[PDB]
Every structure is written in structure tokens, then in C-alpha cells.
Curated annotation (Swiss-Prot), chain D:
Chlorophyll a 5 binds at K152, Q170. The light-harvesting complex (LHC) functions as a light receptor, it captures and delivers excitation energy to photosystems with which it is closely associated. May channel protons produced in the catalytic Mn center of water oxidation into the thylakoid lumen. This is Chlorophyll a-b binding protein P4, chloroplastic. Induction: Down-regulated by UV-B. It comes from Pisum sativum (Garden pea). It is a multi-pass membrane protein. The chain holds residues 52 to 249 of 252 of the full protein. The keyword Phosphoprotein applies.
Length: 42, 208, 154, 198
């Protein structure tokens, strides 16, 4: 179980998870604020 | 810390795992995935199982008493599931914000004590007041143990605690069943129970 | 106007493009039903198109003879939303990433087997380091004044 | 116990309970260097004193004009009302005067005791206090600059900085005065939040 926690922190798995989460975040941002060319706030 | 070596075992004939000795209450040697083989893992998950069990028991009461006395014309509380929307004096987001502040304070206190035992015991405003329980997850003191009911010496405390953890496991399962029945069917749970009781041999899940 | 570009609210070409695309969509629509799921998807796309064109109208962008929006990055103040404020956002986030990475590298450099922590991350350590990037500008400044950012004697 | 901002969390080794206000709070490691800390203490004190003056002068005029004694504008408007002089003129005067006093403060932070004596009259110096706490003429009432009162000071300054944060975010999202905001939440509160504002 500890060995599993180590394995999950090996480079390919760590990067896979990091980028899947990042992808979900950017996807949802663009689903909420679509077609942005400028910063329309201030 | 009384390593009961031949306790009851969920799977008779097994040989329990080495990390499940017999000390913890409600021990029956069930960890086939080996999710508690490290002592710090085990104590953290002990806290998690405990607090889940108490939350589940509160919830099971709050459903199954009000529903059993709503079917009977005692009260008129709506469906526990549909009670998420029927609106109160305010809306829900603010209600959630005040709940958030209030309960998050308490959970941060419990956090501190889980990671450093007995280091938040007394009150800052009133230092004389002090929680009287000396274990993590069993706070005691006047607030959580004004009846003294809890603090005692083993064979007495150990049994009370095992009883707690078993009631809690059943309550977790109970509210899980309420959820999945009311998502499968479109009914109330007491209706499920009455229908199944009036036709057990036919009013099962295999009705679709 | 600036570089000869007139506003997308006042640009006839900008409008023509909008209505051409909209009714191409609606010509592709007139099928499958007036309520089926394909029709609902196509109508959602139509409404999204209208929202996009109107938002570009609100934000005061510059259009050319093509009828498409152009970008002014010179420093003029009517157009900071185009490049300079998203640029500040980018520089902040990028410095955040790089600062956290350099502090992790420095934190593990004294280990007996440093490569072991490069191919197998120490996740609790990184979890303690992620949030220093929030103030990476001030820290990097006081680290430059300290004579502490640049490895001496290299 | 020199005070904990988190009753479970341990102190940092670089905070010693020496300077007033020490409650052991610096999670982002900003002041794990003594020179950094010497600079940051000063910045905290001075920012806090400016926030104190600013928020008091922002809020008290509001209630004074709201129970009818004098008629003053709102802070987010007062820069527009015409005065006896341009706003450019006042800004330039302000720049020169703040230039002088801030470079004086600078040299005293860099080199305590070196900017004490009057540069015009060769008498009339200052006694040898500490940095961040110039007493003397700047302390006519000769109050005791004791440890108890420095903690008072920095606590008032911190709360004032938070009050400033509040005033500006409030004005930008709601659009009126902070006394407007307060009482209009006061009477009917359970429908007067930041939530209904958003
Ligand atoms: C442990 C806490 C808790 C639980 C178990 C529930 C559960 C539920 N709430 Mg509630 N709520 C909870 C807290 C709170 N709710 C609300 C406010 C609301 C509203 C406003 C509504 C609900 C609704 C619902 C249901 C959502 C239907 C669904 O499939 O959701 C998603 C289900 C999951 C994500 C599965 C989770 C299980 C996990 C093992 C996986 C559901 C049974 C809704 C309802 O009544 O729908 C008809 C609804 O409209 N809740 C507040 C604010 C006061 C809460 C505060 O704690
Ligand atoms: C705005 C006004 C009011 C603000 C109030 C905010 C309160 C916090 C609310 C939300 C913050 C969300 C994120 C919380 C951090 C997650 C926990 C953590 O792993 O964070 C914990 C770390 C620990 O802080 C410092 O961390 C240092 C590094 O230690 C360790 O850090 C790691 C900890 O996992 C590892 O143990 C690693 O081996 C080691 O490097 C030192 O230990 C210091 O003693 C310790 O104080 O940071 C921290 O405290 C957390 C720093 C959060 C700052 C965020 C500011 C706002 C953005
Ligand atoms: C290639 C030549 C050139 C260059 C270099 C510039 C440069 C500039 N022009 Mg200009 N311009 C040019 C050509 C050029 N222009 C031409 C040919 C024209 C004719 C069309 C114009 C017409 C023009 C106009 C009309 C205006 C400008 C303006 C400006 C300034 C706007 C940017 C600014 O305000 O600073 C930057 C803005 C900031 C808020 C600074 C924040 C940046 C931070 C500090 C950096 C981030 C670093 C990191 C994140 C943190 C630091 C960490 C560190 C401690 C390690 C800028 C200095 C504007 C101006 O005058 O400025 C007021 C303006 O009005 N230009
Ligand atoms: C250097 C190359 C480059 C650059 C500068 C851009 C820039 C941009 N692209 Mg693009 N793209 C690129 C390469 C590039 N792209 C490539 C190679 C492809 C092919 C894979 C695409 C395919 C693509 C698509 C399909 C789309 C874009 C879109 C966009 C716009 C998105 C704005 C946004 O995300 O809202 C705002 C996002 C944020 C503010 C994120 C920051 C917030 C952080 C996470 C929080 C921090 C808080 C502190 C933006 C102007 C979108 C668009 O709308 O076009 C107009 C979109 O539809 N791109
Ligand atoms: C969140 C619920 C939860 C948690 C945290 C625990 C935790 C624990 N249990 Mg327990 N258990 C539970 C629920 C839970 N249990 C329920 C509902 C039952 C009744 C079926 C049991 C019956 C049981 C027995 C008989 C025994 C334990 C034991 C233990 C301890 C052994 C260590 C371990 O299992 O590793 C860590 C635990 C976890 C990491 C939680 C696992 C969560 C997984 C991922 C859930 C997977 C989904 C699930 C299979 C399907 C859900 C759908 C379903 C509800 C319809 C440990 C502290 C042993 C003990 O000695 O107790 C002291 C023991 O003998 N449990
Ligand atoms: C964590 C457990 C839990 C939770 C989240 C809830 C949540 C809720 N209960 Mg409930 N309840 C619980 C336990 C719980 N109950 C228990 C253990 C019992 C005794 C068996 C009850 C008996 C009960 C009754 C009789 C009623 C509710 C009602 C309600 C709803 C709003 C009013 C209220 O909370 O009372 C207010 C609490 C204050 C402190 C005030 C709400 C969704 C009421 C409702 O549904 O509104 C019509 C209602 O009629 N509860
Ligand atoms: C049948 C389930 C059950 C059982 C057997 C126990 C048993 C125990 N609990 Mg626990 N607990 C439970 C449910 C249960 N609890 C629930 C649902 C919660 C959430 C509110 C808690 C939260 C809780 C806390 C925070 C603490 C305990 C503590 C204790 C121990 C001290 C005994 C005591 O004074 O409290 C009561 C003993 C009982 C047997 C419960 C009486 C049954 C009541 C009257 C039923 C109420 C009817 C219902 C509301 C309708 C003891 C071994 C305390 C401790 O360890 O002391 C150091 C500790 O501080 N419990
Ligand atoms: C514009 C955006 C950037 C602004 C940067 C602000 C000015 C930075 C210059 C000051 C940095 C500095 O003097 O350190 C200069 C740093 C080295 O840092 C120096 O280290 C010395 C030995 O420890 C002393 O401590 C000096 O006080 C220290 O400044 O190196 C340089 O950047 C090259 C300049 C000459 C050396
Ligand atoms: C089922 C469950 C957990 C089950 C976990 C299991 C089986 C894990 C088993 C194993 O891992 C072990 C242990 C060891 C491994 O080696 C082997 C496996 C097999 C992997 C938890 C439920 C836990 C369920 C909980 C905590 C329920 C709480 C409910 C509350 C608070 C109710 C709140 C309400 O208020 C609302 C929100 C609306 C109101 O109107 C009304 C009500 C409904 C009352
Ligand atoms: C200077 C200031 C305010 C000054 C205002 C003034 C003079 C107002 C002036 C005027 O009103 C008058 C009089 C008249 C009006 O007509 C015109 C104006 C012009 C309006 C506020 C500063 C206010 C400054 C603020 C809010 C500072 C916030 C700092 C924070 C939150 C830091 C927290 C942490 O840093 C720790 C402590 C430890 C780290 O490890 C972790 C983190 C979390 C990073
Ligand atoms: C403004 C503007 C402009 C201009 C610009 C320019 C032209 C500038 C510049 C610039 C420059 C000329 C710069 C420089 C540089 C130099 C050097 C020398 C460097 C450096 C850096 C560093 C050193 C870094 C560090 C770090 C950090 C801090 C982060 C993370 C980590 C690291 C380490 C990476 C334009 C028009 C375009 C646009 C508009 C605006």
C-alpha cells in the first residue's frame, strides 16, 4: 500500500494525473467563458 | 492494547493479517486489500471510519424516524430526498455559508487534535474549562460527556466502543440503501418496506 | 482610426460575416425535425454565435476590410485588455511554476541519492512548496537583493 | 506562550517572540532571513499606520454627515469636488514633501541615529530610540512606548489594513458608502449579504 503510494508518484503517472486535472480545469473554464479574445473586466 | 488472538473472524478459517492484532475495538480482521497495513494509515483511517459512522447515524435517524412517522400521520416533513429544495426563511447558499463557517471551526479543532493530541484541550477565553477525555476521537469533557457515561476502565469502555462502531457500520449501509432505493425506484423507503413485506416472494428488486 | 481600423459595431463587413455564418447554420438546421436533438444542438450553436459576435462588439475591438477583429499591442491604453493585462497574468503564472520548480530542486539537492527524488516525486514536499509561488515576486526580489538568486562563482 | 495563530501548529524557528505582535504566523516562508524580517517589520508598521489614518478619515466623515452635522462627500467622490487649487498642484506639493520625509525615514532605517539632528539648527536633535519608533518631538505627550502599547499599535494597524481591503472591494462590487452597506445589512440581515450582492 505504501509501495503503491510510491509507484503512483513515479514520473509518468504523476505527469498523467497533473495534466488530466489541468485539462479538466481549462476545459471547464472555456465551457463557461467561451470565445475570449480580450480581458473584458478591468 | 489487549491483543485478543482468537477473536471472531469475518471469514472463518482465515488467518487474519499481521497488522490487525485484536487491540482496536470492533476488530474482526477484514482488510483483504491490505489498506491498513501501516500504523499511521491505520490510525488515520480509524478516525475516518469513526466520524463517518457518527455522521451516518445522525443521518439514518433523521431519515428513518421522520419517514416512519410521516407515513403514519404524525408529522408532515417532505421526502428526505426532495427536502433539499423546499425553501426556508432564506435561500440555501447563505444557509450553506453560515453552516460552513460554524462547522469548519469545529472540524479544524478536531484536525489539530488528530495531528497533535491534547494540544487544543482547554478554552483560550476561559482556560479553567478543560475537555476530560484522553484519547483521540473520544473527546469527553463536559460538552461531549457531561453524563460521565463514557470514561471508565477497559472491558467496559472497549465494549461500549465496539457497540458504537457496529451501530455506525449499519447506519452507513442504511443510508446507502435509502439512497439507492430511492434512485432505483421513485418511492419512499417505508413504502419499499411495506410493499416488500406485503409480497416478499415477489416485491423485490427483480420487479423491473 | 488607429492604423485605419474602424470599430466592429460600426463595421458593415463584421455584420455581414455574422449573418452569413448564422444563416449557413440555419440552412444546415432545417432537417431531422423541428425539435429533435440535432436541431437542439444546432440552435445552441446559433445562440453561441450571436453571443460571440455581440461580445466582440461590446469590447470595442478594431476591425479591418476583411471584417475580422485585429489586435493593437503598442501600449495604447484603450487596448490593454488585448495584450498587456493577459501578459501580466501570464508572466505571474509562469514565474509561479518556475519558482516552485527551482525551490523543489534546491530542497532536494542535498539528498544522498538526489536522482531518486527526480524520477520519483516527493509529493508531500511538493505540496508544501506549491503555494510559495503565490508570493514568488516578493521572494524573488528579496532574493535578488540578498545576492541569493545567482549562484556565485559560476 | 507567546500566542499561536493556530493552536495545533508549531512555531517557526526564526520567530522568537521578541518583536511585538509575534503570534508565530508566516506559512509562506517570507521572512526566514533576518534582513528580510528587519525590512518587513518596518513595512508592516508603516503600512498599518497609513491604513489607520485612511480608514478613520474614510468612515468617520460618513456617519458625521449621515446624522446631520456637516455635509461631506463620499471618499470615492471627494477627489472630484473642486478645491481652492488644482488637483495637479496638490499632487506636486505632496510629491515634494513626501520625497523629503520618505528619504529621511530611509536613511534612518539604513543607519539608525544618523538622520536625528536638525539640519538647519545645529541644536535640537532627537534622543536615541529605535527604528520604527521615533519618539522625542514626534512624541510630545511623552507616552510610555512600552511593550503593551506596541502590541496595541500593531493590532490596530492590522485591523485597519483589513478595513481598507473591505472598503475598496465593497465599493467596487456594491457601489455606495460603507455606512450605507453596514446599516442596510443591519436591519434586515438575513437577506443582506455578499451573496445577494452577487
Ligand atoms: C452529507 C450531506 C448531504 C447529502 C448526502 C445530500 C444529498 C442530497 N442533496 Mg443536499 N445533501 C447534503 C447536504 C446539503 N444539501 C443542501 C442543499 C441541497 C439542495 C438545494 C438540493 C439538495 C439535493 C440533494 C440530493 C441531490 C441529488 C443527487 O443525485 O445529487 C448528486 C449525488 C451525488 C454526487 C452522489 C453522492 C454520494 C457519494 C457516495 C458519491 C441528494 C440526495 C437536491 C435535491 O433535492 O434533488 C432532488 C437539491 O436540489 N441539497 C445543503 C445546503 C443547506 C446541504 C448542506 O450540508
Ligand atoms: C487572505 C487573508 C486570509 C487568509 C487565510 C487563509 C487560510 C488558508 C486557507 C486556504 C489555503 C488553501 C491552501 C492550504 C495549503 C495546503 C496545506 C499545505 O500543504 O501547506 C502547508 C505549508 C506549510 O507551511 C510551511 O511549510 C514549510 C515547508 O515544510 C514542509 O512542507 C511540506 C508540508 O506538506 C512537506 O512536509 C515538506 O517536507 C516541507 O518542505 C515549513 O515546514 C514551515 O514550517 C511551514 O510553516 O504552507 C502552508 O502553511 C499553507 C500556505 C497557504 C497560503 C495561501 C495564501 C493565500 C493564497
Ligand atoms: C517597439 C517600440 C516601443 C516600445 C518599447 C514601447 C513601449 C511602451 N509604450 Mg509605445 N508606441 C510605439 C512603440 C513602442 N512603445 C509606437 C511605434 C507607437 C505609435 C503607435 C506607440 C504608442 C504608444 C501609446 C499611445 C502609448 C504607448 C505606451 C507605452 C508603454 C506601455 C507599457 C507600459 O505602460 O508599461 C507596463 C505596464 C505596467 C502596468 C507595468 C507592469 C509590468 C510588471 C512590473 C512586469 C512584470 C514582471 C513580473 C511579472 C514581476 C517582476 C518580478 C521581478 C521582481 C523579478 C511602454 C513603456 C503607453 C504609455 O504611455 O504608457 C503609460 C501609451 O499610452 N505607446
Ligand atoms: C502560443 C500559441 C497560442 C496562443 C497564444 C493561443 C491563445 C488562445 N487560444 Mg489557442 N491553440 C493553440 C495555440 C495558442 N493559442 C494551438 C497550437 C491550438 C491547436 C491545438 C489551439 C487551439 C485553440 C482552440 C480550439 C481554442 C483556442 C483558444 C484560445 C484563446 C483562449 C482564451 C482563453 O483561454 O480564455 C481564458 C483562459 C484563462 C484566463 C486561463 C487563466 C486562468 C487561470 C487558470 C487561473 C489563475 C487565477 C490566478 C487564446 C487567445 C480558444 C478561443 O476562444 O479562441 C478564440 C479556443 O476555442 N486555441
Ligand atoms: C468509509 C467507510 C469505511 C472505512 C474508512 C473503514 C475502515 C476500516 N475498516 Mg471497515 N467496513 C465498512 C466501512 C469502512 N471501513 C462497512 C460499511 C462495513 C460493513 C460491510 C465494514 C466492515 C469492516 C469489518 C468486518 C472490518 C473492518 C475493518 C476496518 C479497518 C481496517 C483497515 C482498512 O480497511 O483500511 C482502510 C479503509 C479504507 C481506505 C476505506 C475503503 C473505502 C473503499 C475505497 C470503498 C470502495 C467502494 C465500496 C467497496 C463500494 C461502495 C458501494 C456500496 C456501499 C454499495 C479500517 C479502519 C476491520 C477492523 O478490524 O476494524 C477495526 C474489520 O475486520 N470493516
Ligand atoms: C446530520 C443529520 C440531519 C440533517 C442534516 C437534517 C436536516 C434537516 N432536517 Mg432533520 N432530523 C435529524 C437529523 C438531521 N436532519 C434527526 C436525528 C432527527 C430525529 C429523528 C430529525 C428530525 C427532523 C424533523 C421532524 C424535521 C427535520 C427537518 C429537517 C430539514 C430542515 C429543518 C431542520 O434541519 O431542523 C432545524 C434545526 C435547527 C437547529 C433549527 C433539514 C433538511 C424538518 C423539515 O424537514 O422541515 C419541514 C422537520 O420536519 N428533521
Ligand atoms: C448506538 C451508537 C453509539 C454508541 C454505542 C456510542 C458509544 C459511545 N460514544 Mg458515541 N456517538 C454516536 C453514537 C454512539 N456512541 C453518534 C450518532 C454520534 C454523533 C452525535 C456520536 C458522537 C460521540 C462523541 C463526540 C463522543 C462519543 C463518545 C462515546 C463513548 C462514551 C459514551 C457516552 O458518554 O456517550 C453515549 C453512549 C451511548 C451508548 C449513546 C446513548 C444512546 C442515545 C441516548 C440514543 C439517542 C436517541 C436518538 C438521538 C434518537 C461511548 C463508547 C464520547 C467518548 O468517547 O467519551 C470520551 C465522545 O466524546 N460519541
Ligand atoms: C525593471 C524590473 C526589474 C527591477 C530590478 C530592480 C533593480 C535590481 C538591481 C539590484 C540588484 C542588486 O543590486 O544586486 C546585484 C546582484 C548581486 O547581489 C549583490 O550581492 C552582493 C554580495 O552578496 C551584495 O550582497 C549586494 O548588496 C547584492 O546586491 O548581481 C547583479 O544583479 C549584478 C549587478 C552588480 C552586482
Ligand atoms: C457505505 C459506506 C462505506 C462502505 C465502505 C466499504 C464497504 C469498504 C470496505 C473495504 O474497504 C474495507 C473497509 C477494507 C478493504 O480491504 C476491503 C473493502 C471491501 C474495500 C459509507 C457510508 C456513509 C454514509 C454516511 C456517512 C451518511 C450520512 C448521512 C447524512 C449525514 C444524512 C443527511 C441528510 O440531511 C440530508 C443531507 C438531507 C436531509 O433532509 C435528510 C438526511 C438524509 C438525514
Ligand atoms: C495602506 C492602506 C490604506 C491606506 C488608505 C488611505 C491612506 C486612504 C486615503 C483616503 O481616504 C482618504 C483619507 C480621503 C479620501 O477622500 C481619499 C482616500 C485616498 C481614499 C491599506 C493597506 C492594506 C494592506 C493589506 C490588506 C495587506 C494584506 C496582507 C496580507 C493579507 C498578508 C498575509 C500573509 O502575509 C502573512 C501575514 C504571512 C504569509 O506567510 C502568508 C500571507 C497570507 C501572505
Ligand atoms: C513594455 C512593452 C513592450 C516592450 C517590451 C520590452 C522591449 C522589454 C524588455 C525586456 C528586457 C530587456 C528584459 C530583460 C531581462 C534580462 C535579464 C538579465 C533576465 C532575467 C530573468 C531571470 C533572471 C529569471 C529568474 C527566475 C524567476 C524570477 C522566475 C522563476 C525562476 C527563474 C530563475 C527562471 C512591448 C512594446 C513589447 C509590448 C507593450 C509593452
Amino acid at each position: 500500500m505504501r509501495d503503491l503510494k510510491t509507484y503512483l508518484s513515479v514520473a509518468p503517472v504523476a505527469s498523467t494525473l497533473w495534466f488530466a486535472a489541468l485539462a479538466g480545469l481549462l476545459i471547464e473554464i472555456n465551457r463557461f467563458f467561451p470565445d475570449a479574445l480580450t480581458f473584458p473586466f478591468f | 492494547t489487549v491483543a485478543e488472538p482468537d477473536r471472531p473472524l469475518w471469514f472463518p478459517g482465515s488467518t487474519p493479517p499481521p497488522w490487525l492484532d485484536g487491540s482496536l475495538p470492533g476488530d474482526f480482521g477484514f482488510d483483504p486489500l491490505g489498506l491498513g497495513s501501516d500504523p499511521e494509515s491505520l490510525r488515520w483511517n480509524v478516525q475516518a471510519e469513526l466520524v463517518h459512522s457518527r455522521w451516518a447515524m445522525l443521518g439514518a435517524a433523521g431519515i428513518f424516524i421522520p419517514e416512519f412517522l410521516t407515513k403514519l400521520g404524525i408529522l408532515n416533513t417532505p421526502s428526505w430526498y426532495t427536502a433539499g429544495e423546499q425553501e426556508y426563511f432564506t435561500d440555501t447558499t447563505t444557509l450553506f455559508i453560515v453552516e460552513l463557517v460554524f462547522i469548519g471551526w469545529a472540524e479544524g479543532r478536531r484536525w489539530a487534535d488528530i495531528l497533535n493530541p491534547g494540544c487544543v484541550n482547554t478554552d483560550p477565553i476561559f482556560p479553567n474549562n478543560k475537555l476530560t477525555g484522553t484519547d483521540v476521537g473520544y473527546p469527553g469533557g463536559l460538552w461531549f460527556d457531561p453524563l460521565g457515561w463514557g470514561s471508565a476502565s477497559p472491558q467496559k469502555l472497549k465494549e461500549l466502543r465496539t457497540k458504537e462502531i457496529k451501530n455506525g457500520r449499519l447506519a452507513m449501509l442504511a443510508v446507502m440503501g435509502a439512497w439507492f432505493q430511492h434512485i432505483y425506484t421513485g418511492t419512499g423507503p417505508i413504502d419499499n418496506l411495506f410493499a416488500h413485506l406485503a409480497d416478499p416472494g415477489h416485491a423485490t428488486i427483480f420487479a423491473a | 482610426d488607429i492604423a485605419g481600423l474602424t470599430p466592429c459595431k460600426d463595421s458593415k463587413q463584421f455584420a455581414k460575416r455574422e449573418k452569413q455564418s448564422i444563416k449557413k447554420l440555419e440552412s444546415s438546421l432545417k432537417l431531422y425535425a423541428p425539435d429533435s436533438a440535432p436541431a437542439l444542438a444546432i440552435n445552441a450553436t446559433i445562440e453561441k454565435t450571436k453571443r460571440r459576435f455581440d461580445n466582440y462588439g461590446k469590447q470595442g475591438l478594431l476591425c479591418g476590410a476583411d471584417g475580422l477583429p485585429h489586435l493593437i499591442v503598442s501600449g495604447d491604453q484603450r487596448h490593454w485588455g488585448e495584450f498587456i493585462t493577459p501578459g501580466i497574468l501570464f508572466l505571474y503564472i509562469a514565474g509561479w511554476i518556475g519558482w516552485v520548480g527551482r525551490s523543489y530542486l534546491i530542497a532536494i539537492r542535498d539528498d544522498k541519492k538526489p536522482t531518486q527524488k527526480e524520477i520519483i516525486i516527493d509529493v508531500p514536499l511538493a505540496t508544501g512548496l506549491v503555494f510559495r509561488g503565490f508570493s514568488w515576486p516578493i521572494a524573488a526580489y528579496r532574493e535578488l537583493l540578498n545576492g541569493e538568486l545567482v549562484a556565485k562563482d559560476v | 506562550k507567546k500566542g499561536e495563530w493556530l493552536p495545533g501548529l508549531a512555531s517557526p524557528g526564526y520567530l522568537t517572540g521578541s518583536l511585538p505582535g509575534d503570534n508565530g504566523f508566516d506559512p509562506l516562508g517570507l521572512a526566514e532571513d533576518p534582513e528580510n524580517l528587519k525590512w518587513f517589520v518596518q513595512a508592516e508598521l508603516v503600512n498599518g499606520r497609513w491604513a489607520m489614518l485612511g480608514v478613520a478619515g474614510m468612515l468617520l466623515p460618513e456617519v458625521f454627515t449621515s446624522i446631520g452635522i456637516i455635509n461631506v462627500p463620499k471618499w470615492y467622490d471627494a477627489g472630484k469636488e473642486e478645491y481652492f487649487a488644482s488637483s495637479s498642484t496638490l499632487f506636486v506639493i505632496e510629491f515634494i514633501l513626501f520625497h523629503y520625509v520618505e528619504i529621511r525615514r530611509w536613511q534612518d532605517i539604513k543607519n539608525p541615529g544618523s538622520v536625528n539632528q536638525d539640519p538647519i539648527f545645529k541644536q535640537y536633535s532627537l534622543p536615541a530610540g529605535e527604528v520604527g519608533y521615533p519618539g522625542g518631538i514626534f512624541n510630545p505627550l511623552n507616552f510610555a512606548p512600552t511593550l503593551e502599547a506596541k502590541e496595541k499599535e500593531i493590532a490596530n494597524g492590522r485591523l485597519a489594513m483589513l478595513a481598507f481591503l473591505g472598503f475598496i472591494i465593497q465599493h467596487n462590487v456594491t457601489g455606495k458608502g460603507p455606512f450605507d452597506n453596514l446599516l442596510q445589512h443591519i436591519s434586515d440581515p438575513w437577506h443582506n449579504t455578499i451573496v445577494q450582492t452577487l
